[PDB]
Amino acid sequence: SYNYAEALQKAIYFYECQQAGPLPEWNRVEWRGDATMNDEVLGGWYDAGAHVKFNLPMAYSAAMLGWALYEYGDDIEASGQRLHLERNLAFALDYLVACDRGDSVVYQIGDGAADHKWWGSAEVIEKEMTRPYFVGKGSAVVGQMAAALAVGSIVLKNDTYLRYAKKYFELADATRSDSTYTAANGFYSSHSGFWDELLWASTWLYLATGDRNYLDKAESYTPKLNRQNQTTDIEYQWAHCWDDCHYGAMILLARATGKEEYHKFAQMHLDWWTPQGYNGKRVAYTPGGLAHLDTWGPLRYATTEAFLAFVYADSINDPALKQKYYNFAKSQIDYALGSNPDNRSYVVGFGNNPPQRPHHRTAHGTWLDKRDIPEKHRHVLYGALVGGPGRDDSYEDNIEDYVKNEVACDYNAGFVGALCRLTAEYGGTPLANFPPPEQRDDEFFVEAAINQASDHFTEIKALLNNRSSWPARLIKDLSYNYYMDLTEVFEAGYSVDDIKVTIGYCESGMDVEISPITHLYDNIYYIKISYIDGTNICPIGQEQYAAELQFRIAAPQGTKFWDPTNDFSYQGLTRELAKTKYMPVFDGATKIFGEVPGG
């Protein structure tokens, strides 16, 4: 129906947009650079539309990418995406390994409140705030880290991941408590508890090792799982998700053991998600045909269940059930790609009328800590599955809607799996030369205005701007030149020594020097304005994106020769601030913007 190969290609590329520094050489995102290089643990993914590293959903997402490869990695050769999927996985797993502290792990980098309060690009966030890290041993987060490393060890043939998988499982199983998992509270609190993570990690360890001691562990955890309301059945009326992976583990155990109890659970759970329901009970459906579990990330939940339904259907022989689950699964993915009442894609940069304003700071590319400016995103977040529509299929593409336009690692994870399965069946051709280059704006530039013009002076208001975004970046050795023609000064019988440079306003905190009037050639001279720590000019807020200086260049009082109209840097200036190419900007000795006399 869709080009699933293209959807997969983009859905994978999304994770490169989420990478924290240092970026691998294979990163394909021209608007990302090395960011958060002062973090206690480097690499990993930023979780969602901001810059916190949250280990629970990050590891969940990595585990799901591993599961996609485990089930369908051989099957996706036509798409050309297998290696992109493997490398993206490896990048997150390396971070999970790097979080090891022995009796504990680093489970979070970033304070959620401070990080989310600020709206700007990853590469400059250290100018705005210092980022704390958090250490603990919560069974849920450590157990999910274990599971991710366990499946990763299989699909990447990597003994180090396996060793760390085992270690993390042992720590999570020794601890049996989420009491040390505090830093994600309210963002990714442990809602279901940690027994489901122990089940999920031990199941994957069994599949990784063939060691029946892990199978025995897995099976011993099923009585500790949460019940469905006040009944004796294991909870089944929810989705496999970052908080709770027992749904997928039961499916794995049904295939691995053949046991009736796991198949019974799998069919009860999946039937509840299908339009046909389970004995009269069913997930909410929108009139447009989307299984709508909850307000937050409904597309995430439905697309993850699509992956589970595909895996389960592929593992059984019954033609009626296989069809029912396959149809359900394909219907939810197709909804996400455009088969919905609005006939629109919910995947950024894919298909018809995709969302253009995802709630994502770095894709937006602002310079002033505002969501509403720029009014269009400067970068394409290719492949991001958004939160999606409400229960009545309603949706509007609005950066302010942090529900419907949210994007996240975990939103994309199960989705990638299901796309792997669909491209495996239907083929499709990935885009060549993906991604294409973006149209860029000017990034470092002077805006200037004539503050005052006199028969003996020119007074300039100049704002040296850093609105960088391809990628956002910091430059310490920033300067700009103001060029003059002193022909009239010399003709009038005066000299350079009769021309005085003064300052009428220098913005607080922007340490600045102004050179003497300096000969270029012929009668062309200039002053250079240099910022000692130009990194303080940065797109982090309304005060900080530009440094303001008012300078005056004056002939003596009572003279009337001064002529700015032959001055190179005066050309086109008005009383209103405007970008000018004739006050060129330098990084050290190198011109990075504008024009130079005769050059």
Ligand X SMILES: OC[C@H]1O[C@@H](O[C@H]2[C@H](O)[C@@H](O)[C@H](O[C@H]3[C@H](O)[C@@H](O)[C@H](O)O[C@@H]3CO)O[C@@H]2CO)[C@H](O)[C@@H](O)[C@@H]1O
139 in Cβ contact with 177 (< 8 Å): yes
Site string for Cl ion, 379-398 (x = CB under 5 A): -x------------------
- Considering the candidates 342, 397, 477, 595, report the single residue annotated as catalytic: 397
Which partner in Br ion, Ca ion, Cl ion, none is near 274 (CB below 5 to 8 A by kind)? Answer: Cl ion
d(CA 271, CA 542): 53
Which partner in Ca ion, a second copy, Cl ion, none is near 192 (CB below 5 to 8 A by kind)? Answer: Ca ion
Give the nearest distance from C-beta 60 to Ca ion in angstroms.
10
State the residue for tokens 């989310």.
116
Question: Is residue 284 close enough to count as binding a second copy by CB under 8 A?
Answer: no
Which partner in Br ion, Cl ion, Ca ion, none is near 596 (CB below 5 to 8 A by kind)? Answer: Cl ion
Interaction residues for a second copy, span 491-510 (CB under 8 A)? 500-510
Nearer to a second copy by Cβ, of 504 and 572: the residue is: 504
Q: And the tokens for 167?
A: 């270690």
CB neighbourhood size of 295 (10 A):
11
75 is catalytic: no
Q: What residues make contact with ligand X under the rule CB under 6 A?
A: 187-189, 191-192, 226, 235, 238, 241, 243-244, 296-297
359 is catalytic: yes
Nearest residue to Ca ion, using CB? 192
Q: Pick the binder of Br ion from 209, 228, 559, 571 (CB under 5 A).
A: 559
Torsions phi, psi for 499 (to 5 deg)? -110, 125
33 in Cβ contact with 126 (< 8 Å): no
CB neighbourhood size of 40 (10 A):
17
148 in Cβ contact with 57 (< 8 Å): no
Nearer to a second copy by Cβ, of 282 and 552: the residue is: 552
Site string for a second copy, 541-560 (x = CB under 8 A): ---------x-x-x------
Report CA torsion sign: 173, 179, 184, 188: positive
Nearer to ligand X by Cβ, of 187 and 278: the residue is: 187
Site string for a second copy, 520-539 (x = CB under 8 A): ------------x-------
Annotated binding site for Ca(2+): 192-193, 196-197, 243, 485, 488, 563, 566-567
- Considering the candidates 240, 269, 292, 359, report the single residue annotated as catalytic: 359
- Considering the candidates 6, 115, 406, 443, report the single residue annotated as catalytic: 406
Using DSSP's 3-state secondary structure scheme, residue 136 falls into strand
Report CA torsion sign: 10, 15, 20, 25: negative
Give the nearest distance from C-beta 109 to Br ion in angstroms.
10
Which partner in ligand X, Cl ion, Ca ion, none is near 485 (CB below 5 to 8 A by kind)? Answer: Ca ion
The torsion region of residue 51 among left (phi > 0), alpha (psi -120 to 50) and beta comes to alpha
Nearer to a second copy by Cβ, of 392 and 511: the residue is: 511
Of 167, 175, 101, whose CA–CA distance to 138 is shortest? Answer: 175
* Opening angle at CA 242, ends 235 and 386, nearest 5: 115
Of 337, 362, 285, whose CA–CA distance to 20 is shortest? Answer: 362
Interaction residues for Cl ion, span 14-43 (CB under 5 A)? 24-25
Give the nearest distance from C-beta 210 to Br ion in angstroms.
32
Q: What residues make contact with Ca ion under the rule CB under 5 A?
A: 140, 192, 196, 244, 485, 563, 566-567
Q: Pick the binder of Cl ion from 9, 79, 274, 339 (CB under 5 A).
A: 274
Torsions phi, psi for 172 (to 5 deg)? -65, -40
d(CA 284, CA 392): 11
Of 316, 300, 165, whose CA–CA distance to 240 is shortest? Answer: 300
* C-alpha to C-alpha distances, 486 to 28, 521, 565, 582, nearest whole angstrom: 49, 11, 11, 17
302 in Cβ contact with 291 (< 8 Å): yes
Nearer to Cl ion by Cβ, of 206 and 444: the residue is: 444
**Amino acid identity, residue 49?**
G
271 is catalytic: no
Which partner in Ca ion, a second copy, Cl ion, none is near 502 (CB below 5 to 8 A by kind)? Answer: a second copy
Which partner in Cl ion, a second copy, Br ion, none is near 436 (CB below 5 to 8 A by kind)? Answer: Cl ion
239 in Cβ contact with 305 (< 8 Å): yes
Q: And the tokens for 204?
A: 């994957």
d(CA 599, CA 597): 5
Question: Is residue 511 close enough to count as binding a second copy by CB under 8 A?
Answer: yes
d(CA 207, CA 194): 20
Give the nearest distance from C-beta 550 to a second copy in angstroms.
8
134 in Cβ contact with 108 (< 8 Å): yes
Which partner in a second copy, Br ion, Cl ion, none is near 510 (CB below 5 to 8 A by kind)? Answer: a second copy
Annotated binding site: 192-193, 196-197, 243, 485, 488, 563, 566-567
Under the rule (CB under 8 A), what is the footprint of a second copy?
500-513, 532, 550, 552, 554
Under the rule (CB under 5 A), what is the footprint of Cl ion?
24-25, 47-50, 52, 186, 189, 274-276, 324, 356, 377, 380, 431, 434, 436, 595-596, 599
By annotation, the residues acting in catalysis are 359, 397, 406
